[PDB]
């Protein structure tokens, strides 16, 4: 059994928008080149997060059906999913993109930025548990779409119109698990577990927030 023509179409639009994500080498160089200290490190990491939110808005606008939602719900979806989507995207990069030595400097900055090991430890435990699953790009992109179109964020008006956009993504993802990794019949359930594990980062992030500065885009999206 295979994706229907309409699921192939849906998967194609998601994949094309996911692949056009890029972070500027201008930022990436700062990881390599700027001075090292708790304040500088937090500043650089805050710049990377600011860029991932911009990439995220561009990704999200091209999701099939998103630009038919009401504007207020569009904002509500972005605010509720930002942290989770950043971590999913960064997970993909640690496990597939970044070599051992530059992941090392990035992590050194993260661990030397004035953030609690309460945050840092589950974060790196998430990265390694996600890297174990050996997800395809298609799985990362659908999962990210499914995180974003989550109908039970606070403050959404029309929850059903969001439900109607998420459920076909869920169906595509389960089909994809049977075709891409049919040697593990429970692959879909493992992806689900990462959905719930991602949700815990909202908790740690809210505690990092209370302790404290940021960019205007981050101030809007997190209040």
């Amino acid at each position: 059994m295979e994706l229907t023509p309409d699921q192939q179409t849906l998967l194609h639009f998601i994949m094309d928008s996911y692949n056009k994500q890029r972070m500027p080498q201008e930022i990436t160089n700062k990881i390599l080149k700027e001075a090292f200290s708790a304040e500088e490190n937090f500043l650089i990491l805050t710049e990377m997060a600011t860029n991932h939110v911009q990439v995220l808005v561009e990704f999200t606008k091209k999701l099939p059906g998103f630009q038919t939602l009401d504007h207020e719900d569009q904002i509500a979806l972005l605010k509720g999913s930002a942290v989770e989507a950043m971590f999913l995207r960064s997970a993909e990069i640690f496990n597939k993109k970044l070599p051992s030595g530059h992941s090392d400097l990035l992590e050194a900055r993260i661990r030397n930025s004035g953030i609690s090991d309460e945050y840092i430890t589950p974060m790196f435990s998430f990265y390694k548990s996600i890297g174990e699953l050996k997800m395809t790009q298609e799985e990362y992109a659908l999962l990210t779409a499914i995180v974003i179109l989550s109908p039970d964020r606070q403050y959404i008006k029309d929850r059903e119109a969001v439900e109607k956009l998420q459920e076909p993504l869920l169906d595509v993802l389960q089909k994809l698990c049977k075709i891409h990794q049919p040697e593990n019949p429970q692959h879909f359930a493992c992806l689900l577990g990462r959905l719930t594990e991602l949700r815990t980062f909202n908790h740690h992030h809210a505690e990092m927030l209370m302790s404290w500065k940021f960019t205007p885009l981050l101030c809007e999206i997190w209040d």
């Binding site: 808005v57 885009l217 999206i221």
Partner: peptide, 10 residues
């Protein structure tokens, strides 16, 4: 959400 909505409408 001035900056967010600006990025949404581009």
């Amino acid at each position: 959400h001035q900056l967010l909505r600006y990025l949404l409408d581009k």
